[PDB]
User: Fold this.
Amino acid sequence: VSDEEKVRIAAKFITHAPPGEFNEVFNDVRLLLNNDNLLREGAAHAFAQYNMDQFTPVKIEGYDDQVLITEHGDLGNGRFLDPRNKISFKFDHLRKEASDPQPEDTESALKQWRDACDSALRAYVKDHYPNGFCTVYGKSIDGQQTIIACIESHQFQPKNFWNGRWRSEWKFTITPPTAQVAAVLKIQVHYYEDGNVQLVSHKDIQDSVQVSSDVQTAKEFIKIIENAENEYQTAISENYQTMSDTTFKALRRQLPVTRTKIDWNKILS
Amino acid sequence: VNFDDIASSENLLHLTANRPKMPGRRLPG
Amino acid sequence: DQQLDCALDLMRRLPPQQIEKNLSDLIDLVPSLCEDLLSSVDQPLKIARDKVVGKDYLLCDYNRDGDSYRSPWSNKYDPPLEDGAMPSARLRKLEVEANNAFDQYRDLYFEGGVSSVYLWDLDHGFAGVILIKKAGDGSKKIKGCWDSIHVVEVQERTAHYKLTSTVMLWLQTNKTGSGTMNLGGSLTRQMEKDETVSDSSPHIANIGRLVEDMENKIRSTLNEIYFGKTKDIVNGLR
Assistant:
């Protein structure tokens, strides 16, 4: 196995760290590769990739509420955009710290829509998530005016050997009188007290909404998001119940039909 | 950029590490 | 080092859904740990067919030699081998005994699936693995699989038993719900005990009760962790 293949594997592992365990996974891989130069040069991308993939929320000094690190905010040169506070900031992927906030020109013909959606979503997120954060981007892709709503929520409890994270990304492609709606909802949970058990799930959403006033549409968008996310959470709950009451039970009995543990001398006859 | 900066997996305990080993078997190719 | 410790730690964290690819990636990353990783990283059990006896048997590292695997029924390697590692005559007789006993255990608790027991000599006794593999019938669009890997060390009037048991549990469904949902992985537990060895309480009975007690316990714990704990975590995400 070549050094190039070793570092590709190292980068892959790093990018597959479960939520809240990036440092542990990074350290393991670093000690296994045992070549800091190779790691630096061949897995440099892996830190940024992971953070943006995970919608890592970061706190900026002087601004309440946090902002999500996502591909949509990547300003290059190690800086990221906070469309709500109209700022750019430096972000260190390794130390996961923001620094050097600077006013950033955010003006756009999407400006007022991004803002109406953002204020509505922020309220939706405070209500629906215990530890939620959201970042809404307004940009033109392929000339099409698009609102990109990103939601993150996590609960890290390494001391109880578990971490979990929700991520949702909603894309509204505006084409009056109708907006095209695409979304990906994701959940990952990791439990590892004397084991390694993980829930991995995601659902793709495809839909459309009537577009009207800036304010009314925001209401429409958030209503779509709410119905979809509740539906998904409900379906997940339904799967758990079915896995518990049907599949798990059928895999192994609690006790043999005798309703007593096995008499092993008998079995040996 | 510094890597000793990033701390730190104090490793979990590994129950499978101490099971009886059956030494002296050919590896797969 | 320490590389072994990190390797195991990494397998505790990388998604179990890619458990097989994880291991071979890890072997590629650190070629020198190959034997250690192959023996300490548990993997889903594979079913092979013993053409001679017309019975299924389970593949894992413990019945492997080179690229071939030993059937517990015919006591032969497939692909055939000139000098494959075999159990002594004494231990082979016990192994056949254990396979017969755990076959009935399998039927009693799992009402299906496949079982296999492989034994091997130790300095002051012997060890063995008891493997059970059971696939779900796929009802309600849920695919399920249960793997038992019970590894026992016996130090031989009375004997000391050390049991390290891993159960793997995989649940998956692709309802439009819901979208893709995968809930899987494994738990490991360990027990030790001295017990009398006698006519009425032979080694196979002693190991039997140990495996049964352990597995009943783990079944209950899987229920709590999979359907209690991970669900509670989801609900608080929320």
Summary: Chain B touches chain C through 18 residues (CB under 8 Å). Residues 20 and 29 of chain B are 24 Å apart (CA to CA). The radius of gyration of chain B is 17 Å.
